[PDB]
Design an enzyme around this catalytic site. Structure first.
Site, PDB file in Angstrom:
ATOM      1  N   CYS A 157     -49.782 -46.615  14.219  1.00 44.76           N
ATOM      2  CA  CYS A 157     -48.679 -46.436  13.495  1.00 44.76           C
ATOM      3  C   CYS A 157     -48.242 -47.639  12.335  1.00 44.76           C
ATOM      4  CB  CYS A 157     -47.445 -45.980  14.427  1.00 44.76           C
ATOM      5  SG  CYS A 157     -47.823 -44.545  15.295  1.00 44.76           S
ATOM      6  N   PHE A 208     -45.528 -36.161  17.550  1.00 45.54           N
ATOM      7  CA  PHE A 208     -46.627 -36.514  16.682  1.00 45.54           C
ATOM      8  C   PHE A 208     -46.861 -35.226  16.033  1.00 45.54           C
ATOM      9  CE2 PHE A 208     -48.353 -39.871  19.806  1.00 45.54           C
ATOM     10  CZ  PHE A 208     -47.999 -40.924  18.855  1.00 45.54           C
ATOM     11  N   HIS A 302     -41.146 -47.282   9.689  1.00 42.93           N
ATOM     12  CA  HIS A 302     -41.937 -46.411  10.374  1.00 42.93           C
ATOM     13  C   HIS A 302     -41.115 -45.766  11.501  1.00 42.93           C
ATOM     14  CE1 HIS A 302     -45.072 -44.185  12.550  1.00 42.93           C
ATOM     15  NE2 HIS A 302     -44.778 -44.730  13.752  1.00 42.93           N
ATOM     16  N   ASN A 335     -43.722 -37.775  13.688  1.00 41.36           N
ATOM     17  CA  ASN A 335     -44.262 -38.960  13.497  1.00 41.36           C
ATOM     18  C   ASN A 335     -45.574 -38.458  13.250  1.00 41.36           C
ATOM     19  OD1 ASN A 335     -45.758 -41.512  13.915  1.00 41.36           O
ATOM     20  ND2 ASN A 335     -44.653 -41.887  16.058  1.00 41.36           N
TER      21      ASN A 335
HETATM   22  O1  NAR Z   1     -52.615 -41.662  20.405  1.00 42.62           O
HETATM   23  C1  NAR Z   1     -52.279 -41.766  19.152  1.00 42.62           C
HETATM   24  C2  NAR Z   1     -52.346 -40.405  18.524  1.00 42.62           C
HETATM   25  C3  NAR Z   1     -52.089 -40.961  16.929  1.00 42.62           C
HETATM   26  C4  NAR Z   1     -51.882 -39.613  16.123  1.00 42.62           C
HETATM   27  C5  NAR Z   1     -50.786 -39.261  15.387  1.00 42.62           C
HETATM   28  C6  NAR Z   1     -50.608 -38.354  14.628  1.00 42.62           C
HETATM   29  C7  NAR Z   1     -51.777 -37.555  14.290  1.00 42.62           C
HETATM   30  O2  NAR Z   1     -51.423 -36.611  13.675  1.00 42.62           O
HETATM   31  C8  NAR Z   1     -52.917 -37.982  14.968  1.00 42.62           C
HETATM   32  C9  NAR Z   1     -52.927 -38.966  15.733  1.00 42.62           C
HETATM   33  O3  NAR Z   1     -51.236 -41.944  16.678  1.00 42.62           O
HETATM   34  C10 NAR Z   1     -51.130 -43.091  17.372  1.00 42.62           C
HETATM   35  C11 NAR Z   1     -50.680 -44.169  16.795  1.00 42.62           C
HETATM   36  C12 NAR Z   1     -50.536 -45.292  17.372  1.00 42.62           C
HETATM   37  O4  NAR Z   1     -50.151 -46.347  17.158  1.00 42.62           O
HETATM   38  C13 NAR Z   1     -51.169 -45.257  18.867  1.00 42.62           C
HETATM   39  C14 NAR Z   1     -51.729 -44.378  19.500  1.00 42.62           C
HETATM   40  O5  NAR Z   1     -52.246 -44.073  20.564  1.00 42.62           O
HETATM   41  C15 NAR Z   1     -51.958 -43.042  18.558  1.00 42.62           C
END
Ligand code: NAR
Ligand code: NAR
Lengths: 389, 389
Positions: A157, A208, A302, A335
């Site tokens: 993220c 998500f 974010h 998200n």
């Molecule tokens: O496990 C995930 C899934 C991922 C995710 C989000 C949206 C999407 O469309 C696809 C993947 O985002 C993340 C972001 C992170 O910081 C840590 C994480 O573990 C993850």
């Protein structure tokens, strides 16, 4: 200097976004999720998930995974079944495809021929492959075969801050460089049935969503030809204290797994003030104008979840309208990991133009883009808006 | 300029390397590999593998995987067994650990305190995780919590060129920046038993070794304090024509799989001349000195295998001593994917000092570093040596 450098600040020259067409409204998601997952019998788990959706501040999300696709691939509707090869077979194709749509929109807005793209940064948390999603997007777009590519896998993220941090040096250190920046995320890599044993994954199922965003970043925009929207002036990265294992994510044979082991909202909100005060002191040093107040800055934050925004806003004493653009994107898309802050940047500029504000940052001159992710990593970009009309 | 830029060319200020202590001599590897894999009955496959080792131009390799570890984990000695979680559990730990050893050596040589590292680039083809190998190395080394990190996952054999291409912009665009660059590769991610159905994976079993290399890259070295060894002056990246699917690598539930579907030596050698002539014309433009001849350049070439070097050397008419440093590293370490070219850079500088040559590039002023990998991607870095004594 065998490679001439640029002069001005790296600038966002265009933004495009794309989402899967299938929409799931959050009011419908508890029934949709527990139905397609064969878990309606888990009645107390289901009302705990209802409670998380009620509080999510997410109204709808766009999702590649349909009920049809899920029913055709029952290993995705399970909770802990071997699935990675099938997940990969989906996202190695569809993550670059979604990114192509966003990139084509950004290129169209930019208005120059696609062969003027000299660099490509592709960021994703959804799948890995060799050649990577950067190569696939270059092929899908027909970019020059000599484009300088970079693929940022398994970022999470904070990755929307990371790609700006890198693009700034690529654009500023190379005269004439035009950097295509793409973040593309598809939840097929992480979607799984619910359990009472790992409630982390439940939170992810409530928040998500899917989406891609794309930027053209370059220094020295050609006057009357290219248009700057935001300028990158300062970047910083920090590992927050006492945050080891606050967010982990592992690529397993059952796919990508998501773990929260600390109070992420508390860790971010207790530490963000010192980071911002430090960053702003670097940008506005006494020796000289004092830094703008938090309420006189524009904010691209974010939205990992509503509790992060609520606690940051509370701890920093932000006026309630500061996070409006951020919460609008959370509301309408959820998200989307690394893509989310670029959707907010797009929302903010479009609101500013629509409302005839004096700058692309809601009428403020200076602003902050913040990514948060595994580490716990905080990416801070200090931006300058561009005056409108 | 809220962040001051540097002035001089990005320079390699120190190089460290590390390998697993366990050595396997190539004379012993056919017996070792087919024994621990329960495949000595496959007598014709085994002599085809003997023939590949006889021609590999690899005398020894360093390998994390021992007979003990292999016998304790029989899913690695199979050919197509689910294994990824066990492979990941190894390399997410041991790839940063090996990188720590190389980084500590580079820092020691550099001579400045580790907290002067402002940026970190971590490149690997061996495993993925969140937080990534960059975070783990930062923790292992005790780097500043504000170090600006970048993890390059799933890069493959061109990645040694990629990290230099990125480090050059980071160092040149940030006054005072000191970039720790680490490539670390452990074959536990790809090791599998042999088959007669996919002979690609056999070639990998004859060539791939383990290793990490680490650089300090920075502009404007402090006189009499820091020491430059090589300067980065020009970078280029190319997707070779008619090479789609020449090298694929997929992260599957059985681990990382390796595919060759085209004549990689032919594709590289037929196209490299035009790429080099173009790159050298950019560095030495007529308007002015003509570019040095190939034999008056120093050569740091990724040794994907002996056939690539033989055909490149043949097609370009290189004198037989030009690829000596490259072949020495191939001989003593095998193909360590992205780390290999930095081992060759280290070998070349140490030979030049040892033999009291006039420059760190074997007495030549200008040189070429070439990475080749999935794409088919060719990374070209034009380097300048540094005069010795
Ligand atoms: O496990 C995930 C899934 C991922 C995710 C989000 C949206 C999407 O469309 C696809 C993947 O985002 C993340 C972001 C992170 O910081 C840590 C994480 O573990 C993850
Ligand atoms: O499949 C692999 C294995 C990998 C590797 C080499 C050495 C090592 O120690 C660990 C991994 O290198 C590669 C490099 C590539 O360009 C493409 C590939 O498919 C691979």
């Amino acid at each position: 200097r065998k490679m001439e450098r640029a002069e001005g600040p790296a600038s966002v020259l265009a933004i495009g976004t794309a989402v899967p067409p299938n929409v799931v409204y959050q009011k419908d998601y508890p029934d949709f999720y527990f139905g397609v997952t064969n878990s309606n019998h888990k009645t107390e788990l289901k009302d705990k998930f209802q409670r998380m959706c009620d509080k999510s501040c997410v109204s709808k999300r766009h999702l590649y995974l349909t009920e049809e696709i899920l029913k055709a691939n029952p290993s995705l509707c399970a909770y802990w079944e071997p699935s990675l090869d099938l997940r990969q077979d989906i996202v190695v194709v569809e993550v670059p495809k979604l990114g192509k749509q966003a990139a084509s929109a950004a290129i169209k807005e930019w208005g120059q021929p696609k062969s003027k793209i000299t660099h490509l940064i592709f960021c994703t948390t959804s799948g890995v492959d060799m050649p990577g999603a950067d190569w696939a997007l270059a092929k899908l777009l027909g970019l020059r075969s000599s484009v300088k590519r970079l693929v940022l896998y398994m970022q999470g993220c904070y990755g929307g801050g990371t790609v700006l941090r890198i693009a700034k040096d690529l654009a500023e250190n190379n005269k004439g460089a035009r950097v295509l920046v793409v973040c593309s995320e598809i939840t097929a890599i992480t979607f799984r049935g619910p359990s009472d044993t790992h409630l982390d994954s439940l939170v992810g199922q409530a928040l998500f969503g899917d989406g891609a965003s794309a930027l053209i970043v370059g220094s020295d925009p050609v006057p009357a030809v290219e248009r700057a929207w935001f300028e990158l002036h300062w970047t910083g990265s920090d590992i927050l204290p006492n945050s080891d294992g606050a967010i982990d994510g592992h690529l397993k044979e059952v796919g990508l797994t998501f773990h929260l082991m600390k109070d992420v909202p508390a860790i971010i909100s207790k530490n963000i003030g010192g980071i911002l005060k430090d960053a702003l002191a670097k940008v506005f040093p006494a020796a000289a104008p004092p830094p703008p107040t938090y309420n006189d800055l524009f904010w691209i934050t974010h939205p990992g979840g509503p509790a992060i925004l609520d606690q940051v806003e509370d701890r920093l004493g932000l006026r309630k309208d500061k996070l409006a653009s951020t919460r609008a994107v959370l509301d309408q898309f959820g998200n989307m990991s690394s893509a989310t802050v670029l959707f907010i940047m797009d929302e903010m500029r479009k609101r500013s133009v629509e409302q005839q504000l004096g700058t692309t940052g809601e009428g403020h001159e200076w602003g902050l883009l913040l990514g948060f992710g595994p580490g716990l990593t905080c990416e801070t970009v200090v931006l300058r808006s561009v005056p409108l009309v």
